[PDB]
Design brief:
part of a larger assembly; 9 chains; B: two-stranded antiparallel sheet; 5 helices; C: alpha+beta; Ribosomal Protein S5, domain 2; 5-stranded mixed sheet; 5 strands; elongated; binds magnesium ion; RNA-binding; ribosomal protein (chain E); 40S ribosomal protein S25 (chain E); ribonucleoprotein (chain E); Ribosomal_uS13 (chain F); ribosomal protein (chain F)
Amino acid sequence: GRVRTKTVKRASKALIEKYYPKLTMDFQTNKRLCDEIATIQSKRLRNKIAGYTTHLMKRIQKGPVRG
Amino acid sequence: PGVSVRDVPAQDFINNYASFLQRQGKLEVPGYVDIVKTSAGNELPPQDSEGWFYKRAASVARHIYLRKQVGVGKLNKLYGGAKNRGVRPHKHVDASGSINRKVLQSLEKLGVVEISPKGGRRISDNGLRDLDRIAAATLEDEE
Amino acid sequence: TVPSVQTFGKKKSATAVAHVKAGKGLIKVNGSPITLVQPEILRFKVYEPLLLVGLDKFANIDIRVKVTGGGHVSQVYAIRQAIAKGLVAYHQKFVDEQSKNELKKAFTSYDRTLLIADSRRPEPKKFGGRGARSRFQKSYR
Amino acid sequence: LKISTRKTPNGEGSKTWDTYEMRIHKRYIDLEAPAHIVKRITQITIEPGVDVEVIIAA
Amino acid sequence: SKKSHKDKAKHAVVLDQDKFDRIMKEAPTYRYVSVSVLVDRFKLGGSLARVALRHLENEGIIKPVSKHSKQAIYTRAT
Amino acid sequence: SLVVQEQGSFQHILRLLNTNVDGNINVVYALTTIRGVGRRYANLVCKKADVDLHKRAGELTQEELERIVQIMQNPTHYKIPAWFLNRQKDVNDGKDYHSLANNLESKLRDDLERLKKIRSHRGIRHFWGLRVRGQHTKTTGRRRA
Amino acid sequence: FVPVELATTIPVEIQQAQQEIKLFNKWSFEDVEVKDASLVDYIQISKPIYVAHTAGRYANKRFRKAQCPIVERLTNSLMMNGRNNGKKLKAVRIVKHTLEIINVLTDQNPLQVVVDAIINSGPREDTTRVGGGGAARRQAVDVSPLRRVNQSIALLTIGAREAAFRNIKTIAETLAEELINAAKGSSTSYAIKKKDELERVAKSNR
Amino acid sequence: AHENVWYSHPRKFGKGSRQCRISGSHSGLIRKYGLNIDRQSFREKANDIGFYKYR
Amino acid sequence: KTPVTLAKVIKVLGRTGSRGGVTQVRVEFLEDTTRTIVRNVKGPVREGDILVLMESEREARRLR
RNA sequence: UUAAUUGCGAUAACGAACGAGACCUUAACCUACUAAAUAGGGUUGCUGGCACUUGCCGGUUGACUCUUCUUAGAGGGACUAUCGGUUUCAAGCCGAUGGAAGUUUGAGGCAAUAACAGGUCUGUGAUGCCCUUAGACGUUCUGGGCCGCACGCGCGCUACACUGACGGAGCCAGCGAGUACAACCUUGGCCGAGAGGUCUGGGUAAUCUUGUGAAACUCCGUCGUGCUGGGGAUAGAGCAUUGUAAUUAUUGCUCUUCAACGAGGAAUUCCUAGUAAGCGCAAGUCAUCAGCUUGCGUUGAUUACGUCCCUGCCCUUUGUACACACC
Ligand SMILES: [Mg+2]
Ligand SMILES: [Mg+2]
Ligand SMILES: [Mg+2]
Ligand SMILES: [Mg+2]
Ligand SMILES: [Mg+2]
Ligand SMILES: [Mg+2]
Ligand SMILES: [Mg+2]
Ligand SMILES: [Mg+2]
Ligand SMILES: [Mg+2]
Ligand SMILES: [Mg+2]
Ligand SMILES: [Mg+2]
Ligand SMILES: [Mg+2]
Ligand SMILES: [Mg+2]
Ligand SMILES: [Mg+2]
Ligand SMILES: [Mg+2]
Ligand SMILES: [Mg+2]
Ligand SMILES: [Mg+2]
Ligand SMILES: [Mg+2]
Ligand SMILES: [Mg+2]
Ligand SMILES: [Mg+2]
């Protein structure tokens, strides 16, 4: 039952919309990017945010997506 | 080559050392044997009515050899299991103290156990030599 | 100095620390040779790495294991893991890569726990239940 | 440092308990050090909450 | 309590000579031997089942397969 | 290891201290079937009489029976301790005895009727047939049978 | 066979040819095959084991119970009552004694006897409660091969238990008797009797 | 109230030998580590004492 | 006679029954693999099992 | 679709808030860092024994050195990561692989709006009102009771035995706790058969009890289907401990009588993995007393991995003569 509630999805959406040139396909690089360019309080939320950011990046690479 | 008691299976070592101590006339048994439960937890005396004290002495001597040094009350904790407390849950009941004290003094007389400075009793050089000797006896007895 | 390493293997609350050295094929647990592991019916469990690998693989290797904590069979599984991991770590450190991977293939194809510590451990108890997940009886009337 | 306590002040209600606890950390330190500087160190840098104790052991 | 079992003594508490020839004659031809197998034939009480079973390890009348306590596993000598 | 056991001598029934006892049980557990004698006391008595522990009661000889009987009527003569005895300190005459088959039940009955006559709360509780040792009776002993 | 010299002297029979794993160093897992084709892949003879005792996580996913060694599943089903529930070393000893006993009687390598008894004693058609309260009906249905294995183990151990209860024979001996009788179709076996009687009920309630 | 008889009963031990230190009550006392506070007042003042709900 | 036949499931059609404990599958015979039935099973199944049937003309009916 | 008003979305709805999630504690994994005579290890001393080959098993608060395990700080680590299926191809689901870990990673702690005439004046020097306030419903002292017993019911404990009881022998934990203005945890040495007694010595605690050498368990024997060596209730006598005080047996110990009990009807309870269950230990009650509870660990499974059939819960639609709401 992993659904990635509001916060992670909205944060990843804003991350992509403001930092697409810097984001990559790899989870670890985007994790370091999330650490540096955004102040996520905890680290589990940081990891969820980076994971969904990578997923959205992969979807974008496949093609153009809504939202 | 060389052999220690750690190199021989336990139960065989206690059995053979008890047999050897029973064969020789040393290690006097207290006159109160045959009458004692050996523990409050137990409800009958040992099935082997005569000679069980020799087995207890053998086990005690092996235990002192293996460990650092052991007193009497610690042996009380070691022996003795669960008492059938009638219709109440079983607990742990320490074994009889007089029996283990007599074992320790008898082993002192045979010279196999020495009083340790840190309290309790440790093994002595002569008794430890006897212990490894009987361990070898058992080991080459096996094959 | 003598080529020597130290590894460990754990069970629920058991812990076996094994020192491996370049010896003469000498395997002792708690100062006693491996053939006298107490439960005597899980004895084959502790020979398992020996027979899976083959004794000739470590004939000039000596083994010293101190196992503490946990009950009997937990200790036995701890010694199993300690011996296996010690063999693998020694082969990695001083022997060769291929030998180590061959040992890992022989091991992990049989009782994966032999190199990987078990993750299952007891569940904390809770009030209103005499067990960790059980519950008291209900009256209802 | 743990205490279990029944929540209900009057025994009525489903059996519910709770566990309160602190943790005490000790972190002792010993020095093979000269006299006056050590005592000055002990008499300075004190934070409420943490309790400092000094044993000469000489 | 309810003695509906209606069991008899049904066990030779003491061995008798003819029963000794019986134990010896089918000491072989009992291709598997154990304490329960011995008492199954009504000829042993059960405590002397162990006695007779242990005595048969005298001239190799039967061979042991495993001598664990709480039971025994014996086969005919071949 | 085994013996034919001399067909024609192994007893099957015995009368020790005017109670019938089947002899085929092990000696100690056969002796246990007499009132006032339990497994511990019978075991010690058989030990003192030097008769084999693992022997059957129906095969031991006659003077063995008499020596056993003599041992278990004046125990203090045969180094049976002051303790381990059935009735010690004997509050009629202060001499630690050991009650036996008929003597045990009889003397228990005299002690019971003494407690009845003494008008002790324990005695009147015994006379009524209720619990004596001070346990709750709201929920226990709720039928006589 | 090439006894390896070491400072610790492992017994020769434990060193002989040990690329030949046996169950209790007595029975070969090779030569043992499943006669029935339906119950293959639900009886684990493929993987050799030196003991019928493994701390395997055989209850995490749905179907890993099949991958557990079949002798191990028999052991785990022996340790079934309140008085003896956690005791498994006792179950391992009982199974070892039963295997030796079965080796004695009709040698027929006892693992094959175990497998054949499990094959025979598992029902192939069963009933389910379908009646809508007012009318009580049992509707005949088919059983999964995994449930066939589970049920066969269940009745085998249950019959051994009820035979051993307040009886002279040891649990190992009664289990060996049940396994031997279920190796054939001998109706004297309790497990095979329950199998036949349940199947004929299911036939009576098509 | 003869001093020989008034409050003469010993109170070295038992239920009533010690009180609540909060309420003076003798029921539901916590003697662990010498807290000597009854359970309810302990639940009230645990956070001030240093005790917290943690798991 | 002993007309015991085998049938390998090719698909599982959900779980049926008032109890919720029985399932329904589509089995295809080991012989004549173009001949299939729908059959009720009582226990855990998945794509690959081989059921044993004492019938061949029976077809599964949803249990209510 | 999700465990989720969890999301993908469609849209007279747009933006938001609480709840859920997030969050903390705990359990993992750390041969990566910092370190350690209140934790361990190696080498070497000084020794003991056996082997005789240089080796094995030991002892020492003698030295040097190290942190793998034991600790605890800062950190790392998993985010369903990669891949394959399936999905208005979106949310997501399923499988395999790599992993320590892939059920929200397991277990919890807090936990919304509204409400109950739910419980507590008997926890409070929280308390309104009413009552009493001198031979008192205040306070204290003595003794009794809260434990009675023709009877019903609710948590449990011990059992009905062979997978066992009883003897010996093996010998394995993790949570704790522990004395000062008082007298706690007790080692060790002597006594006693035991409970216990006495003499000394540690420990205000990773130092001492303590490696809590616990039970179940394991090995070898006795028993042998007999209400029997199962079961240990009910009693008789005696020996001790705490206590100002033990009778209405406080509790422990020794000998004996050994009862009901043959796996328990209708009915009904708890529980899907280190789970149930078996087994005990610690702590809270404690001057003495648990068959209790809260925690902890040992051995450790069968069967699911689904459904709305019984009992209920959530959302939607519908009907209602119900709103103290189908009691
Ligand atoms: Mg013992
Ligand atoms: Mg019992
Ligand atoms: Mg439990
Ligand atoms: Mg480390
Ligand atoms: Mg995909
Ligand atoms: Mg959670
Ligand atoms: Mg009300
Ligand atoms: Mg008032
Ligand atoms: Mg009351
Ligand atoms: Mg309750
Ligand atoms: Mg035992
Ligand atoms: Mg410990
Ligand atoms: Mg113990
Ligand atoms: Mg009896
Ligand atoms: Mg008994
Ligand atoms: Mg039990
Ligand atoms: Mg209570
Ligand atoms: Mg479910
Ligand atoms: Mg109205
Ligand atoms: Mg109506």
